[PDB]
Structure 1
């Protein structure tokens, strides 16, 4: 389970640098930031998957229709393709809970 074992707040400082070194290659998170390889993530926590305007998503991500929160985000980041088979996000995954917690802490702050 997720709504059992998952998110506990971590370091936003650390999470910002994990976003830079691991996610920035394909995504922006600031308000008004553009879509790149991956879509802009501003407001992601208040949204279902495959909904940013102007981005070409896979049919799988749309169909999955996940309402993003800390728990589903934690699962997707662990192994994106295991969580949404057919997704085109090419990211090996963040296997350590500590790393995922730092990153999500950062993301929930920056995406609002």
Structure 2
């Protein structure tokens, strides 16, 4: 629930994601909470991501951020994961502020 702490955790995402609407290694993450999974038009998602379905609910997001390949097997997102629930919670709060 701490957006300020979440901002710091986002430092682990900035190498591939932006919050300014621009897509790069990964799709822009501004407005990602509750967003259709694989919903950014034009971004070249992996087949597993496109087949996942549903939305990026806070729960779906926290699980994915703990272990990306366990939630979306075969994803092209090469991030090891955030093992601490507090870090995931704070990051999600930060993302929610950037909706």
Name the TM-score, length of structure 1 as normaliser: 0.84
Larger mean Cα displacement after TM superposition, 72-81 or 34-43: 34-43
Q: Distance in 1 between matches of 2:8 and 2:84?
A: 16
**Partner of residue 2 from structure 2, selected from 8, 11, 22:** 11
Kindly indicate whether the alpha-carbon contact (under 8 Å) linking 1:14 and 1:103 is maintained by their aligned counterparts in 2.
Answer: yes
Alignment of 1:43-82 (within 5 A): 43-82=31-70
Secondary structure class of the residue paired with 2:33: helix
Instruction: Structure 2: give runs of 5+ residues left out of the alignment.
Output: none
Number of corresponding residues: 99
Instruction: Structure 1: give runs of 5+ residues left out of the alignment.
Output: 1-9
- Residue 41 of structure 1 corresponds to which residue in structure 2? 29
Q: What RMSD, in angstroms, separates the aligned Cα atoms of the two structures?
A: 1.0
Kindly indicate whether the alpha-carbon contact (under 8 Å) linking 1:74 and 1:100 is maintained by their aligned counterparts in 2.
Answer: yes
Q: Distance in 1 between matches of 2:16 and 2:43?
A: 13
